[PDB]
Design a protein around this ligand. Sequence first.
Ligand SMILES: Cc1ncc(COP(=O)(O)O)c(CN)c1O
Ligand SMILES: Cc1ncc(COP(=O)(O)O)c(CN)c1O
Lengths: 453, 453
Amino acid sequence: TTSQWRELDAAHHLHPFTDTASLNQAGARVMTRGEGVYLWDSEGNKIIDGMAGLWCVNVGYGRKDFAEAARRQMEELPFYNTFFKTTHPAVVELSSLLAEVTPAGFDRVFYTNSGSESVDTMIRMVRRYWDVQGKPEKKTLIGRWNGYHGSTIGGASLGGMKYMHEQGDLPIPGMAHIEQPWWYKHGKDMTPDEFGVVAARWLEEKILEIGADKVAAFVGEPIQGAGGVIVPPATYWPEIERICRKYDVLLVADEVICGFGRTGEWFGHQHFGFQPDLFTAAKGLSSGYLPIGAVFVGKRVAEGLIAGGDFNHGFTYSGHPVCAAVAHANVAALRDEGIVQRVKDDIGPYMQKRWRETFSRFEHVDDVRGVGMVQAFTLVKNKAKRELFPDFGEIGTLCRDIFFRNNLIMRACGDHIVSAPPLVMTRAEVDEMLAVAERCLEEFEQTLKARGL
Amino acid sequence: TTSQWRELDAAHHLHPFTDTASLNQAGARVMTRGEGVYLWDSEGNKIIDGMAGLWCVNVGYGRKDFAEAARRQMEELPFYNTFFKTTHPAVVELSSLLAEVTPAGFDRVFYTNSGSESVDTMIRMVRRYWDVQGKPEKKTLIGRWNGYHGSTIGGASLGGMKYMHEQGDLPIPGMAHIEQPWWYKHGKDMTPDEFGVVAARWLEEKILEIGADKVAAFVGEPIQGAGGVIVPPATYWPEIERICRKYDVLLVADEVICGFGRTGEWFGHQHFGFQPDLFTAAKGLSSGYLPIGAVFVGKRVAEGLIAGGDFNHGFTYSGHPVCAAVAHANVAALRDEGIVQRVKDDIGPYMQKRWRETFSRFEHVDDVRGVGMVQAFTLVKNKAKRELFPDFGEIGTLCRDIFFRNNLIMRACGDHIVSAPPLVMTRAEVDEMLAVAERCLEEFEQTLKARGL
Ligand SMILES: Cc1ncc(COP(=O)(O)O)c(CN)c1O
Ligand SMILES: Cc1ncc(COP(=O)(O)O)c(CN)c1O
């Protein structure tokens, strides 16, 4: 029963990013089944999954073909390691397919179990690369305040969430942070395009404050996900790239979210028009059907790692055959069923138009934004004056609770509301989701006013 | 073909703990199928897997029931996150079953994708614990030289492999290391039991040097795996535990290898008779059939973490439903099919007797050792003098290459040779494996002499 599952969960399970005592007193929501864009819970609610699991179930729920690929691989060879001068066909075939869907010059992939492990891999690869170049001082990686790069000690350090830094005595050494390109807060009297150049040049100013000979890499999500779908101006990434090339700093895209079609390009960096030296992946790589991540290593960094002999790094389940077989089915479906192309040409433009049509009218909604199948808005105290609520996050929590009670999953990141539904969502699904979201915002506005805004 | 698979692997795949240029020149061995204790490669060789994948395929290859459990869960609900005050039946049922097979006082489990992530989780938990206790200086974790705790930045820093420290600028702060309890090298004129007390007192020396008020935890593998199946004396772990309790230091077992039956007990700390405050797991948790790890949190540390409110840590695939369903089937089989009990009562004692009967006679083999279904020996230049070969690892590589050419997988850790076969191996299989190993060592002794070493 719901009761028994909640009691066992409270007794035995510690959840990610959770206040355990609060969750155990409230009761966990038990999700039992998924099909297309929908979920069911243990109380029989049918739920619109406007978050695709956690930005990751890109082909939607219910792929029986993926379950068959897993079953077949698991019966033949459930596991073999890639440590003993050994490989297996599933990881070879996935590596070959991944070279076809990635840009030219990304031939070589290193596998992990998660986006967090891909980020730690990338940190060790970047530092190893500069050692092989004979630059042992070039070790600092620069991230952003409100960037998210996972939950390993490495990834939490590179990320810019102070609430994670405060648990574990982070960041570790050789990590620095610049402000995020959040125009609504930091744009002063500028247009987004003017601001994009200013926000990019924060990187150059930080490189010069530290010393360029000490800086290994700049790492960024093309769009900041957990930070609230912070979509940088069009001028931002070309300027970041120019600054990285000027100082001989590696450029790293964290594609764990934007990867595998979320923007309508295969990768977020293709949408924003920059060319990273390496990029990190997970999530959409297998649509979340099994845990797998990757680091895609460009030609320059690959040659440096190869010139360095032993790379003393990796995970038991790196290249796991069952995970590789499911990822292969998933990437083959994204390409061969035209799912990525449909985001670029059809459902992305429709979602973006309908999202702006739906939210733009609300008194306490501003900065309506998105690309492809990631979109967001911010809850604001005064739209005219672009004033935010104090205690950023309290009002976002009120709004997300209304969504959840109405069987719609959209997440609050502070007072940002975000959505990243399965890429296969139909136009009709998009309209159904926006109709429920619109009713939830009307209730939100009524509640604000009733309670004294 | 073998040729086509090797060419694609060389072009596209970066392997864990590998010299890529050397592997791509040699050609990777392509493993295609597994059954019981055996593997087949792309050239049709049948191979005895004396390493159970990578110390992890505890129930052996060919569990069609596990593939069915994976298929069924993947069709129903392939993924849902445990972040949104959400849970799902598979992770609840696994959490309940794990409380039944773990010692009393380990009710609460935190899920990861890997042993490395479990170690990073444990480091952030132990630091968070001491913050909640109001001891914010108590942050240093102590490990051992030649200890292995994974390949995240955190796990590589806590581990004691200098060849990992040198790639990534590790260890991170708040990490210290003591010498390993390796009697053959460090025991001088002591008995093993005398040496166990001296080697444990190295921990006391390190605590007093740092200051107990700055030390959060001591972390150790019950038996050092990747370091070469370093089996400590019987006096070691009781003395470690006495020292940790004296100085108010948490005691952490890394059970990633010893866990899930490898010693004949469910966990290595039960064999060696110490009670850790937390322990890390992966590998045998799912017999490697899908990626999953865990941190088992004892009552005292669990209460501290719960009293701390939000724990700002976790992974997208934490508690992954498909991985949890397979882990559940695996743990149920270990208990209900009597597999762990059989290691303790039957196959463990048989292996340990036959291992000692097989190797003890060879002129350049010494320190023949093991417990349950993990066993090892050291290749030595002169047994009388306990003189090791120079360039520790070169002679182990020669010996491992003979095994691999004879379709037997045993791993070299420097000049240690180690074995950890599936726990379901039959007595007959054990004799088959030992007969091949014996012939390989005869060849090894002939090759040593032929080459003047
Ligand atoms: C941009 C980014 N990078 C890294 C990670 C970490 O991935 P994982 O949770 O699979 O460890 C995430 C997870 N949301 C992410 O969004
Ligand atoms: C004791 C120990 N701890 C942690 C790890 C890391 O586990 P993983 O490779 O699954 O990240 C290993 C891996 N062999 C290990 O042997």
